[PDB]
Design a protein around this ligand. Structure first.
Ligand SMILES: NCCc1ccc(O)c(O)c1
Lengths: 213, 392, 224
C-alpha cells in the first residue's frame, strides 16, 4: 500500500500569518492527491483536487503544490475560520489511503497552570469509594505532565485523565486527573499530593493535603 | 479489458489521453492509407488540390474550433470530430469520382481540426502540472508517428488480399470502436461553457513568446513536409532505386520520431525546453544539409534518423510551452492557444508538396535541402528568448 | 440540494453485527458511487469501500473484506454497511461520502458531499444512572485570590450527559472536560472558578441531567 505520511499532528499559527502543511507519498503518486478540510463540528469538505486545482468556492488563500512525491497545502492569510483539520488522500492505486490529519491552533503567551486538589466527598466515602481530583487550568503549552504521590509512592493505577480542547475565549487548555481508591486503601494512608510538570517552570507545581485535616 | 475492470474502477485522466492518442492515430492512418490509391481541369491542378484540401480546410477551421471550445466545451467538439471522421471514412469507402474524394478530404480536414484542437486543449486543461503535461503531450504526440508508421503496410496488405474497399471498411470499424470507447468517458450531450473568458486570439498573436514557439514548430515541420514527397523523385532520378527502396528509405525518419516524441517529453523539463528546441532545430538543419550528400540507400539512414529525432524533440518541447506561456502571461484558457499550434503544424503540410516541387524543378533538390537547412539553423538562436519570459 | 443523512449514534454489544444506513436525497441515486470510510478517535481515516448503486458493484479494502458488507436499496435510495462480529476495536465514527465527476466527463476528482458520521460504540454495559459528588475545597486554604469548585459524575454508561451550574447562571469560568470510558462506565468532571467572597455567601449548585435514564440531581456544594 501507499503510505501518505503527514508529519506534524498539531501546528500553531497566528491570524494573518502563512502556514504550510506537507504530505509525503511513498510510491510516486502522480498528482492524484486531494486535500480535505474538516471544521470542528462539521463533516469534511474538499479544498484542492488533483494536487494543484482549487475547488469551487474555496478562497484564494488556499493553494496546493507538488514537488516530486511531496505535496504542500499553503494558506497565505490565516483567518479565524481556517482553524480546522486538514488531511490528504491518494487514489492512484487501491486501497485509498489518507494521511493523519493536521490541526491548526492559535498562539499566545505562555501561562503557568493553576493547580487545585480536592479530596473525596463525604457521600462517596459513605458509599465505600474514594476519589481524589486534580484540576490543572489555564495553561497555553498543550504538553503537560501530571504525577500522583501517596507518601512518595508514584502510583500509575487508577489514574484517569481528561483533556480540554483550546479555549475559544482565552486560547488556553485544561486537564483533570482523578485517582480512584477503595475506602479501606484511602483510610490507610495519610498524605496525598498532585504535582504538575510544565514548560513554564522547571520546578513542578505541587498541591498536597493530609487526611487528618 | 475484462468487463469487471470496466465496471469497478475510478475513471482516471489517462482515459482522456488514450482517447486523444487513438483519435490522432486513426486520423493519421486515414491520411496515409489514401495516398497510394489517389492516382487510381488540368490533372496537375486536380492532384495538387486533392493533396492540399485536407490541410487547407483544417488550417481554415482551426480558429473557429478554438473559440467554440471556450463557448461550449471540449467533449462536444471531440465527438463532432469523431462523427465527421467516420463519415469521411465511409465516403472514402463508397466513392469513385473526383468531387466525392475532394469532399471526403475536406471532411477529414474538418474532423482532424476538431479532434486535434479540442483534445490538446482538454489535455492541457486537465493536466496543469508542467512535468505531467509534458509527459502526456509527448505520449499523445507519439500517435502521429504510430499512425504514419502503421498506415502504409496496413493499406497495402488489405488492398490486394481482400479488396479495394477493405482497408476503408476496417478503418471505419476501428473508428466505431474508438467512438464506443469515447462514449464511456465523456458526456457529449450537455453544453458546459468555461468559467472564465479567454484572451482574444488577436492578443495572443501579438505575444512575441508565442510567435517564437509557433515559428519553431512551423519551420521544423515544413522541412519534413517538403522532403517527404521530393525524396522519392530524386532517388529514382539519381540512385535508380527500385520501388520498395522508395518506401523503406523514409522508415528511419518515422521510427526516430516515434522514439523521440516518447522519450523527450520527460527530458525536456529537466534539460530546459528552450535548449531542447534550440538543439532540435540545429540538428534538423545539419541533417537536412547532409541529406543530399548520399549516393546509396545506406547514406539516407543516418540523416533521416537525425531529422526525425530532432523534429520529435522540437515538437515535444514546444507543445507544452504554449500552455505554460498562456498560464504565465494570459488567462488560463487553452482552447485558442493550441489552434495556433495546429495552424503551425498544418501550414507546412498545406504548402509542402507544391512549393517543394516548384523549387526542385526550378533550382534542384540539393539547393532546396540547403535552403531548408540554412533557414532552420538561422531560426534556431531565436529559442533563447523562451528561457525566462516576463510574468503577468 | 445534495444530502446524505446518517444515524447519530449506535450502541452494539460485543460479538454482534450492526447495520449502518446512509440516506441520499437531492440527486439521482444510481448515478454516483458511495464511499464508506472509518475514523478511529486519535487516529487517521481508513477507507472501507466503494459501491455503485446502479450496477451494485462493490470494491473492498483487503483489510475490511470479512468485517464490512456494502448493500444498496434503490427503492428508498439508501446505502447500508453491515459489520459482523464486532469487537472493542470497531468503536469509531463511520462516514458516508459521494464521488463527483469532472464537468462534462466521468472521471473522478473529489468526494464533494460527505454525511455526518455515525458513532458506533461496542460495550457490554447496560443503562445506569450517574452518581454526582460535590467537590469542596480543602479544609482551610482561605486564599483571597479566588476559589474553585467542582462536581464529579461517575458510573453512567450512556454517553450524553449535560452538566450546568445554577441552571446556566454561571458560564464564565466553567470548565467541562470530555467524558472518558473506563471499565465500561463513563466519568465526567467539571470545575467553576469564582471570586473568594462569592462562594461562602452565594450558593453554588451543580445540575446534572441524564437523558437516556431520566434523572435530574441538584447538588449544593457546601464548605467542609
Ligand atoms: N509532426 C509529424 C512529423 C512527421 C514525423 C514522421 C513522419 O513520417 C512524417 O511524415 C511526419
Amino acid at each position: 500500500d501507499i503510505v501518505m505520511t503527514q508529519s506534524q499532528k498539531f501546528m500553531s499559527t497566528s491570524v494573518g500569518d502563512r502556514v504550510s502543511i506537507t504530505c509525503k507519498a511513498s510510491q510516486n503518486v502522480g498528482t492524484d492527491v486531494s486535500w480535505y478540510q474538516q471544521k470542528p463540528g462539521k463533516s469534511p469538505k474538499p479544498l484542492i483536487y488533483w494536487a494543484s486545482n482549487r475547488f469551487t468556492g474555496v478562497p484564494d488563500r488556499f493553494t496546493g503544490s507538488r514537488s516530486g512525491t511531496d505535496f504542500t497545502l499553503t494558506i497565505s492569510n490565516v483567518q479565524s475560520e481556517d482553524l480546522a483539520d486538514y488531511f490528504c488522500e491518494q487514489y492512484s492505486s487501491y486501497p485509498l489511503t489518507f494521511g493523519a490529519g493536521t490541526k491548526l491552533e492559535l498562539k499566545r503567551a505562555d501561562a503557568a497552570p493553576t493547580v487545585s486538589i480536592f479530596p473525596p466527598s463525604s457521600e462517596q466515602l459513605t458509599s465505600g469509594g474514594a476519589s481524589v481530583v486534580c484540576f490543572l487550568n489555564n495553561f497555553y503549552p498543550k504538553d503537560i505532565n501530571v504525577k500522583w504521590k501517596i507518601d512518595g509512592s508514584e502510583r500509575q493505577n487508577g489514574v484517569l485523565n481528561s483533556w480540554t480542547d483550546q479555549d475559544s475565549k482565552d486560547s488556553t487548555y485544561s486537564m483533570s486527573s482523578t485517582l480512584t481508591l477503595t475506602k479501606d486503601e484511602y483510610e490507610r494512608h495519610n498524605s496525598y499530593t498532585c504535582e504538575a510538570t510544565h514548560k513554564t517552570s522547571t520546578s513542578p507545581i505541587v498541591k498536597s493535603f493530609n487526611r487528618n485535616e | 479489458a475484462l468487463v469487471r475492470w470496466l465496471q469497478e474502477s475510478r475513471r482516471s485522466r489517462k482515459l482522456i489521453l488514450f482517447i486523444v492518442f487513438l483519435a490522432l492515430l486513426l486520423d493519421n492512418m486515414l491520411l496515409t492509407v489514401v495516398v497510394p490509391i489517389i492516382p487510381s481541369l488540368n490533372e496537375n491542378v486536380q492532384v495538387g488540390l486533392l493533396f492540399a484540401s485536407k490541410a487547407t480546410v483544417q488550417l481554415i477551421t482551426n480558429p473557429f474550433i478554438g473559440l467554440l471550445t471556450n463557448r461550449i466545451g471540449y467533449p462536444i467538439p471531440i465527438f463532432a470530430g469523431f462523427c465527421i471522421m467516420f463519415v469521411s471514412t465511409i465516403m472514402f469507402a463508397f466513392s469513385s469520382s473526383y468531387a466525392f474524394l475532394l469532399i471526403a478530404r475536406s471532411l477529414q480536414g474538418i474532423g482532424s481540426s476538431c479532434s486535434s484542437v479540442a483534445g490538446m486543449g482538454m489535455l492541457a486543461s486537465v493536466y496543469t502540472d508542467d512535468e505531467e503535461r509534458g509527459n502526456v503531450m509527448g505520449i499523445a504526440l507519439g500517435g502521429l508517428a504510430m499512425g504514419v508508421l502503421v498506415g502504409p503496410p496496413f493499406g497495402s496488405v488489405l488492398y490486394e488480399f481482400v479488396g479495394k474497399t477493405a482497408p476503408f471498411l476496417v478503418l471505419a470499424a476501428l473508428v466505431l470502436l474508438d467512438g464506443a470507447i469515447q462514449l464511456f468517458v465523456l458526456q457529449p450531450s450537455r453544453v458546459q461553457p468555461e468559467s472564465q473568458k479567454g484572451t482574444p486570439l488577436t492578443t495572443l498573436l501579438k505575444d512575441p513568446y508565442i510567435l517564437i514557439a509557433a515559428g519553431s514548430i512551423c519551420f521544423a515541420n515544413m522541412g519534413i513536409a517538403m522532403l517527404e514527397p521530393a525524396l522519392p523523385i530524386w532517388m529514382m532520378e539519381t540512385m535508380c532505386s527500385r520501388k520498395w527502396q522508395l518506401g523503406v528509405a523514409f522508415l528511419p525518419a518515422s521510427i526516430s520520431y516515434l522514439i523521440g516524441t516518447n522519450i523527450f517529453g520527460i527530458l525536456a523539463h529537466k534539460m530546459g525546453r528552450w535548449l531542447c528546441a534550440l538543439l532540435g532545430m540545429i540538428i534538423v538543419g545539419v541533417s537536412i544539409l547532409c541529406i543530399p550528400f548520399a549516393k546509396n540507400i545506406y547514406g539516407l539512414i543516418a540523416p533521416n534518423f537525425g531529422v526525425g529525432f530532432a523534429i520529435g524533440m522540437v515538437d515535444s518541447s514546444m507543445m507544452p510551452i504554449m500552455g505554460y506561456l498562456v498560464d504565465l502571461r494570459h488567462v488560463s484558457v487553452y482552447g485558442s492557444v493550441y489552434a495556433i499550434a495546429d495552424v503551425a503544424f498544418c501550414m507546412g503540410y498545406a504548402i509542402g508538396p507544391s512549393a517543394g516541387g516548384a523549387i526542385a524543378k526550378a533550382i534542384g533538390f540539393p539547393w532546396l535541402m540547403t535552403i531548408i537547412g540554412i533557414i532552420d539553423i538561422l531560426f534556431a538562436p531565436l529559442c533563447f528568448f523562451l528561457r525566462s519570459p516576463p510574468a503577468k | 440540494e445534495v444530502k446524505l443523512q446518517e444515524s447519530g449514534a449506535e450502541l452494539v454489544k460485543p460479538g454482534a453485527s450492526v447495520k449502518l444506513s446512509c440516506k441520499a436525497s437531492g440527486y439521482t441515486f444510481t448515478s454516483y458511487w458511495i464511499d464508506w470510510v472509518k475514523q478511529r478517535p486519535g487516529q487517521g481515516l481508513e477507507w472501507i469501500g466503494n459501491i455503485y448503486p446502479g450496477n451494485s458493484s462493490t470494491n473492498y479494502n483487503e483489510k475490511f473484506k470479512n468485517k464490512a458488507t456494502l448493500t444498496v436499496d434503490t427503492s428508498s435510495s439508501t446505502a447500508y454497511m453491515q459489520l459482523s462480529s464486532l469487537t472493542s476495536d470497531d468503536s469509531a465514527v463511520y462516514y458516508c461520502a459521494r464521488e463527483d465527476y469532472y464537468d462534462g466527463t466521468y472521471v473522478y476528482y473529489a468526494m464533494d458531499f460527505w454525511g455526518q458520521g455515525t458513532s458506533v460504540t461496542v460495550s457490554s454495559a447496560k443503562t445506569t444512572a450517574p452518581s454526582v459528588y460535590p467537590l469542596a475545597p480543602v479544609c482551610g486554604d482561605t486564599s483571597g485570590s479566588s476559589v474553585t469548585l467542582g462536581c464529579l459524575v461517575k458510573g453512567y454508561f450512556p454517553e450524553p450527559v449535560t452538566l450546568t451550574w445554577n441552571s446556566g447562571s454561571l458560564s464564565s469560568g466553567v470548565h467541562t472536560f470530555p467524558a472518558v470510558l473506563q471499565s465500561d462506565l463513563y466519568t465526567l468532571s467539571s470545575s467553576v472558578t469564582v471570586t473568594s467572597s462569592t462562594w461562602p455567601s452565594q450558593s453554588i449548585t451543580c445540575n446534572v441531567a441524564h437523558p437516556a435514564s431520566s434523572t435530574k440531581v441538584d447538588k449544593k456544594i457546601e464548605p467542609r
